[PDB]
């Protein structure tokens, strides 16, 4: 996160760390959607141009964290992946279209003060909150500056959704229906962004109807971190929802 704040304890109990077994190392953020499933960006597992292609075991999930780096002895929980499911039509070749994957934990985790799943949107919740101007919230333990570093605690920032056309006009990349961008305008005089290490993290909204938190997006990609005239791009979780249900009453 660039231009964030330190999260408060228990502010994002669904936040999850993807942790490198060896070299032990922070891979990306993810989110807990049930006691056995985690959602992340397909590009934290499989990214062929960078030679990245992680397996169920080069991998470890860390839940209920606050500290980026400390083993948080009676708060965090660590699990093992039973399996990984990548969107069959994820496009690493040109723009990360469909940047989404599901991770099924070997054993379910138990909920607590620091661990609780985020809700997945319904077609009507999605309908009313996904509007240019509405803010959402991104959390991560990534880069604090485009290039220097890494924070000591979970960082947080609130950003506004931007209209598609401005989104498309900020870059040469081809934007699809499964993406949405976010951030302030150079003239809004407020700023902040997701950055390296934040990927696979959740972009969330609080529903004013039921007072519940909804995961609307997954941090996917950007072009620099916090540059004027650029925005962050997020997977549109509600558009990918059929794919989610399906892998869940399939292998769940």
């Amino acid at each position: 996160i660039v231009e964030g704040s330190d999260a408060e304890i228990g502010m994002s109990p669904w936040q999850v760390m993807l942790f490198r077994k060896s070299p032990q190392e922070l891979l990306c953020g993810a989110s807990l959607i049930s006691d056995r499933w985690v959602l992340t960006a397909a590009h934290c597992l499989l990214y062929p141009p960078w030679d990245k292609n992680f397996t169920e075991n080069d991998l470890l999930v860390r839940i209920g964290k606050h500290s980026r780096t400390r083993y948080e002895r009676n708060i965090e929980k660590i699990s093992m992946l039973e399996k990984i499911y990548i969107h069959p039509r994820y496009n690493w070749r040109e723009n990360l279209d469909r940047d989404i994957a599901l991770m099924k934990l070997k054993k379910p985790v138990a909920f607590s003060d620091y661990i609780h799943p985020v809700c997945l949107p319904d077609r009507e919740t999605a309908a009313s909150l996904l509007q240019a101007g509405y803010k959402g919230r991104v959390t991560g333990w990534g880069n604090l500056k485009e290039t220097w570093g890494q924070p000591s605690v979970l960082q947080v920032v609130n950003l506004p959704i931007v209209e598609r056309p401005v989104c498309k006009d900020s870059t040469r990349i081809r934007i699809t229906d499964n993406m949405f961008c976010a951030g302030y305008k150079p003239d809004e005089g407020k700023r902040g962004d997701a950055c390296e290490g934040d990927s696979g993290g959740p972009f969330v909204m609080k529903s004013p109807f039921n007072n519940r938190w909804y995961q609307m997006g997954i941090v996917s990609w950007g072009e620099g971190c916090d540059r004027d005239g650029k925005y962050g791009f997020y997977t549109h979780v509600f558009r990918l929802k059929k794919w989610i249900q399906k892998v869940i009453d399939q292998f769940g």
Binding site: F19, Q24, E25, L60, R70, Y71, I78
Partner: peptide, 9 residues
């Protein structure tokens, strides 16, 4: 700068 994970994991 990672602290140590318990080996059981």
């Amino acid at each position: 700068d990672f602290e140590e994970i318990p080996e059981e994991y």
